[PDB]
Every structure is written in C-alpha cells, then in structure tokens.
C-alpha cells in the first residue's frame, strides 16, 4: 500500500521537465482524441463558435516507466504542473479556458509501459468565417485547427489516435 508512494517518487526523481521525451532520438509521437460535449453558440456577427470538449493527448515517454504494479495509476491533477506536456494549442481560439470547478478539470494516467494520457476539459470560442452571400440559404464550414507552437516535425509528430474514430461525440451535438 505504501510502496506506491516510493514508486511515484522514483518516477519523479531524475525527470527533466524542460526536456522532451527522447531529446536526441526521433520525434515523439503524440496521438490526440477529442470528445465533443456541445457547441452552444454560433455567432455570425462575431464570426465564431463556442465549443466544449475533452482533449486527450497520449504520448510515449520512457522516463516514467515503472514496474511491480501493472495497475494503471491515475494521478491527481496537480502532477500536471511537474511533468512535460506537449505545447499543443489551437490557432483559431479567440478566447478559451479550462473549467475549474470544483477543482481544475485535468487528469493524468501513467500506464505501466511509460506512456502518459493527459486530459483536459476545454471551452474555446474558435474563430470561423461564414460566407453570408447566400444567407439564410447557406452552408457553413467551421474548422478547429490544432498545431504545435515551437516544435517542428523533427521534434514532435501529431496524429489522430484511433483513425477516423478519434473524435467521438458528434452525434451528441444539436443546434437550433
């Protein structure tokens, strides 16, 4: 029972938060999943739409590999402040935040193979154009654009985890 504390401490010990996984090695592969909750507002005047979602990022880091307890350890949110995470950001986010009631909506789960599954509950007012030349007989195409800030393809690689099933929750959406 107490051994898990020493296990997680040894996992933390030696970790360099300022260094990406496999710094000299090939680029780290980061899969992503988006569980949509709802799109409450779509403003044509402001040219944007508010979207709420669960953003999962899954990446393989060898520095956090433990043994002797194959149970997938789900840690508290605060550990996210003491670990390396991707610099992923949305290009279109006019204004966005992470929900913080009762505590910060965040989760990390270190599976025994060293991988990490970061999770965030994110609301974002993404900027979308709407060609109103045919309004109200019009059809809109609105896109969320996920991109890395500083790291290039030689350092970090993005892919959709699960192929076409990466995004799950589109059917849950409904608009007036």
């Amino acid at each position: 029972m107490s051994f898990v504390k020493e296990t997680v401490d040894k996992l933390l010990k030696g970790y360099d938060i300022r260094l990406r996984p496999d710094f000299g090695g090939p680029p780290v592969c980061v899969g992503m999943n988006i569980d949509i909750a709802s799109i409450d507002m779509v403003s044509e005047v402001n040219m944007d739409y508010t979207l709420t979602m669960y953003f999962q990022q899954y990446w393989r880091d060898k520095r956090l590999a433990y043994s002797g307890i194959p149970l997938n350890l789900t840690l508290d949110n605060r550990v996210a402040d003491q670990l390396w995470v991707p610099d992923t950001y949305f290009l279109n986010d006019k204004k966005s935040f992470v929900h913080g009631v009762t505590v910060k909506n965040r989760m990390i789960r270190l599976h025994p193979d060293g991988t990490v599954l970061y999770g965030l509950r994110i609301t974002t007012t993404a900027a979308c154009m709407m060609d109103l030349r045919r309004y109200p007989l019009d059809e809109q195409n609105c896109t969320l654009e996920i991109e890395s800030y500083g790291y290039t393809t030689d350092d970090i690689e993005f892919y959709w985890r699960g192929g076409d099933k990466a995004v799950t929750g589109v059917e849950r959406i409904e608009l007036p």
Partner: nanobody, 106 residues
Framework: LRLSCAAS????????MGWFRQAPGKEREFVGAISWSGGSTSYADSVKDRFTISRDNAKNTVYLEMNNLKPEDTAVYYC??????????????????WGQGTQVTV
C-alpha cells in the same frame, strides 16, 4: 428489409436512439445509432457500408435499412434509447427504456 421503431412519450429527453443485435448464446452488440437532428449517424465497423439508419418526424423516427444479409446476421435486434448526458453509444448498460426485440433469421 426495413426495420422500424416507434418511440412514444417524452422522446425529447432521450434524443439519441439506436439498434443493437444479439444471437442465441451471445451478448448484445452495438449495431448503430441516430441523433435527434438526424444529420449525423454512427455505425459499427462490422456493419459499415451495408446497414443504414435514418430519422423522420412524428412518432416513428428510427428506420434501419438492411442490405447484404449473411447467415451470421441471424439474431434478435433491439431498439433502444439513451439520455442526453450519458456515456458512449457502444455500451448497452447506458441505455434505458429498451424495446421489444424483433427476430430476423436469414
């Protein structure tokens, strides 16, 4: 063959509704799902490109079109409905107010 499902009552509170299948000696398996708007669908990989689902107004708002039947498809198919804020579609336990299974034998 066109399977139909009619939902009566407070149908608005249970927007997403779907189809499951079960053969004798087997457990329920997800076949497909349709949402309130009707412009979005969800199908399992095993029934991709063959079975389709559509929504209509009024009462019978769930229609399942079956194509390219196979002997493994011999089963009883259940209509089911789910609440708005509930888990994933694939898992049957999230569903409530189950329907009466219709038996189809190829």
């Amino acid at each position: 063959l066109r399977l139909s499902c009619a939902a009566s009552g407070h149908t608005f509170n249970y927007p997403i509704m779907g189809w499951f299948r079960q053969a004798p000696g087997k457990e329920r398996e997800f076949v497909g799902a349709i949402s309130w708007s009707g412009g979005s669908t969800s199908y399992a990989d095993s029934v991709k490109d063959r079975f389709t689902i559509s929504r209509d107004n009024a009462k019978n708002t769930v229609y399942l079109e079956m194509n390219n039947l196979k002997p493994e498809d011999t089963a009883v198919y259940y209509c089911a409905a789910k609440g708005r804020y509930s888990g994933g579609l694939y898992y049957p336990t999230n569903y409530d107010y189950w329907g009466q299974g219709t038996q189809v034998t190829v």
